[PDB]
Amino acid sequence: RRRIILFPVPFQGHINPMLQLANVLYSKGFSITIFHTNFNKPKTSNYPHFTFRFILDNDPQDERISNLPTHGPLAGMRIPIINEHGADELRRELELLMLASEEDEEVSCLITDALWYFAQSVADSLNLRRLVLMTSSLFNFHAHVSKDIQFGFSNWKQGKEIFENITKQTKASSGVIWNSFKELEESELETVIREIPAPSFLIPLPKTVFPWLDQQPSRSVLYVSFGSATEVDEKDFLEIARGLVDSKQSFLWVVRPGFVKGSTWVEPLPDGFLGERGRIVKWVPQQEVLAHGAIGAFWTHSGWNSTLESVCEGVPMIFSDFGLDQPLNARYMSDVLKVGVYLENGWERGEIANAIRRVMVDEEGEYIRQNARVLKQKADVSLMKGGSSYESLESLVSYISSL
Ligand SMILES: C=C1C[C@@]23CC[C@H]4[C@@](C)(CCC[C@@]4(C)C(=O)O[C@@H]4O[C@H](CO)[C@@H](O)[C@H](O)[C@H]4O)[C@@H]2CC[C@]1(O[C@@H]1O[C@H](CO)[C@@H](O)[C@H](O)[C@H]1O)C3
Ligand code: NA
């Protein structure tokens, strides 16, 4: 009857929330098409109820779109190229799908990542309403729209121009879905919502057996995962390893193959690393691990969705920055939400070990765990029938029908 088209940005903290949004909407009775680049294409057999359609970089990519690291900060150069060049092809794919539409179905709206600001005038050209998904925090929006990091950004010409384009095309959209809940960022709400005429909807999107974990005492394991796009130099990998050892905590460390530049997997690890404490794996399902009673803390990339998934399960964090990430976001988590510790000095064994001990062992760290557990309760209540997130979602579903 009603189909929604979703068009995510193809990177860690963008894909997952858009897919989760797809699942929510599927469960409210919408059919789902996902438009996605061939680059970082998700695993489609894991979402058999969605139609996937690959666009924008099909077979003959040709140019620099064909070059370009697949990992680290420069991978994202794909995004400005598509914002600049992708309009006519996005338009064609939208038309092809409307032409093949079955007689009993229609397309309700297009939902894009906010970073895909080019999509607004394309949607407008076809008389299709576009909603936007903000995959990151309300605070992040507030900090850029209105002290040291703010002046770092005022010095950054590309960052500022992209942000102005995002902002204008978000305001022009028919609605904004934020990956958050009201009780998490209650001071940001009024100000952010108000700056944007398009109606806002806050929905916290993050809401199998581990034999080795099952044998560990509660809150005894450090879970370490930097996600799918990140990379480090060999020196940094070794400092991460030295830090884990010196913490003397038990750890489950997820290391993607390719995470260490210049090696397939973990060749640089010293002989007899691991011992009786550590476990290393290539991949695990993160939400499931975070829900396990063995996990005492989560050392993560400072991405917002990772962070939200952790507080939604009551797990405190250690935060590391990668690529072009601004310290802003980990500061907010550390110093305002107070649900983890930020590593200020890159990768250094002493700081690493201290942060692990602070969150997992130290008496004076327990406030952090507690803060995390309060947030988890609030998330639970918000999603409760009657709660603010439950009602936001119900209103969005009805609004989509009214477009
Ligand atoms: C206000 C914002 C607009 C903004 C839009 C994306 C954009 C860029 C980062 C500028 C460069 C090109 C481009 C396209 C870029 O490289 O984008 C990055 O591409 C990576 C893949 O190489 C992805 O992994 C990252 O998610 C993506 O940011 C730009 C400026 C700063 C930025 O805020 C940042 O927002 C982030 C939250 O969204 C927050 O984590 C950062 O701390 C914060 O500084 C983001
Ligand atoms: Na061992």
In a 3-state reduction of DSSP, which class is residue 52? strand
Cα-based distances in Å from 374 to 302, 369, 403: 21, 9, 37
For the record, the structure tokens of 67 come out as 């070059």
The H or E element that residue 333 is part of is none
Please, which residues bridge with residue 251 across strands? 222, 278
**Ligand 1 shell residues, CB under 6 Å:** 11, 13, 73, 75-76, 79-80, 115, 136, 140, 144, 158-159, 162-163, 229, 324-326, 328-329
Residue 348 CB neighbours (<10 A):
16
Q: What span, in angstroms and rounded, lies between the C-alpha atoms of 235 and 212?
A: 29
Buried b (16+ CB within 10 A) or exposed e, 195-223: ebeeebbbbbbbbeebeebeebeeeebbb
Report how far residue 317's alpha carbon sits from residue 300's, in angstroms, rounded to the nearest whole number. 7
Q: How far is the CA of 226 from the centre of ligand 2 (A)?
A: 22
C-alpha span between 341 and 83 (Å, rounded): 35
Known catalytic residues? 14, 113
Resolution of the experimental model, in Å, one decimal: 2.1
Distance CA 184, CA 23 (A): 23
Instruction: Please answer whether residues 278 and 251 qualify as being in contact, where contact means their C-beta atoms are separated by less than 8 angstroms.
Output: yes
Angle, CA 142 vertex, CA 228 and CA 182 arms, to 5°: 80
CA of 359 to the centre of ligand 2 (A): 24
Return the C-alpha torsion angle 383, 386, 390, 395, nearest 10: -170
Tokens of 159: 């960052």
Token pair, residue 279, equals 């476990």
Q: How many residues belong to the chain?
A: 403
Residue boundaries of the structural domains of the chain: 2-207+383-402, 211-379
Q: Which of 15, 68, 79, 82 to mutate to test the pocket of ligand 1 (most atoms within 8 A of CB)?
A: 79
- What's the CA-to-centroid distance between 242 and ligand 2, angstroms? 15
Number of Cα atoms under 13 Å in the Cβ half of residue 206? 26
Q: Exposed, middle or buried: residue 170 (CB in 10 Å: 0-12, 13-18, 19+)?
A: buried
- Ligand 1 nearest-atom number relative to CA 79: 14
* CATH of the domain spanning 2-207+383-402: 3.40.50.2000
**Per-residue tokens: 221:** 């394991």
What is the rounded radius of gyration, in angstroms, for the C-alpha atoms of the chain? 21
Report the separation in Å between the CA atom of 366 and the middle of ligand 1, taken as the mean of its atom positions. 32
Per-position DSSP letters for 273-315, written without gaps between them: -STTTEEEES---HHHHHTSTTEEEEEEES-HHHHHHHHTTT-
For the CA of 135, the nearest atom of ligand 1: 38
Residue 129: other Cβ atoms inside 10 A: 16
N-term to C-term CA, the chain: 14
Residue 239's CB is within 10 A of a number of other CB atoms, namely 19
Cα–Cα dist 209/275, whole Å: 23
Cβ atoms of 330 and 342 closer than 8 Å? yes
3-state secondary structure of 57: coil
Give, using CA atoms, the residue closest to atom 21 of ligand 1. Answer: 76
Residue 324's alpha-carbon distances to 14, 135, 149, 152, 235, in angstroms, are 16, 17, 12, 11, 19
Helix (H, G, I), strand (E, B) or coil at 341: strand
Cβ 315 vs Cβ 290: under 8 Å: yes
**64 CB-near residues (< 8 Å, 6+ apart):** 77, 81
**How many other C-beta atoms are found inside a 10 Å radius of the C-beta of residue 293?**
13
Q: Are 170 and 119 in contact (CB under 8 A)?
A: no
Amino acid at the residue 279: R
Nearest-CA residue for atom 27 of ligand 1: 76
Tell me whether domains 2-207+383-402 and 211-379 share a fold. Answer: yes
Probe ligand 1: pick from 156, 169, 324, max atoms within 8 Å of CB? 324
Return d(Cα 181, Cα 189) in angstroms, integer. Answer: 9
d(CA 87, CA 93): 10
Contact between residue 86 and residue 65 where contact means Cβ atoms under 8 Å apart? no
Rounded CA-CA distance 41/53 in Å is: 10
Phi first, then psi: what are they for 335, rounded to 5°?
Answer: -100, -20
Read off the tokens for 254: 């997820």
Structure tokens at 217: 């005492």
Q: What strands, in cross-sheet order, belong to the sheet with 2-7?
A: 51-54, 31-36, 2-7, 106-113, 130-134, 176-178, 200-202
Going by the DSSP 8-state scheme, the letter that residue 211 receives in this structure is H
Q: Distance from the CA of 135 to the center of ligand 2, in angstroms?
A: 38
Distance 354 CA to ligand 1 centre (A): 29
CA dist., res. 107 & res. 119, Å (int): 16
User: Is residue 43 within 8 Å of 66, Cβ to Cβ?
Assistant: no
CA distances from 141 to 191, 211, 328, 385 (A): 10, 41, 11, 29
Q: Which homologous superfamily does the CATH classification assign to the domain defined by 211-379?
A: Glycogen Phosphorylase B; (3.40.50.2000)
Residue nearest atom 18 in ligand 1 by C-alpha distance: 76
CA distance 235 to 263: 12
Measured distance CA(175)–CA(170) in Å, rounded: 8
Residues 6+ apart with CB under 8 A from 350: 243, 246
Q: 29 vs 78, 132, 221, CA distance in Å?
A: 33, 20, 40
Nearest bound ligand to the CA of residue 158: 1
Amino acid of residue 256:
R
Compute φ and ψ for 176, nearest 5 degrees. -125, 125
CA distances from 202 to 179, 185, 263 (A): 6, 10, 41
Q: Is 187 helix (H, G, I), strand (E, B) or coil?
A: coil
**Ligand index nearest the alpha carbon of residue 152:** 1
Q: What single string gives the DSSP state of each residue in 188-205? A: HHHHHHHH-SSPEEE--T
Q: In the structure encoding, which two tokens stand for residue 381, read together?
A: 């209540």
Q: Which residue's C-alpha comes closest to atom 31 of ligand 1?
A: 159
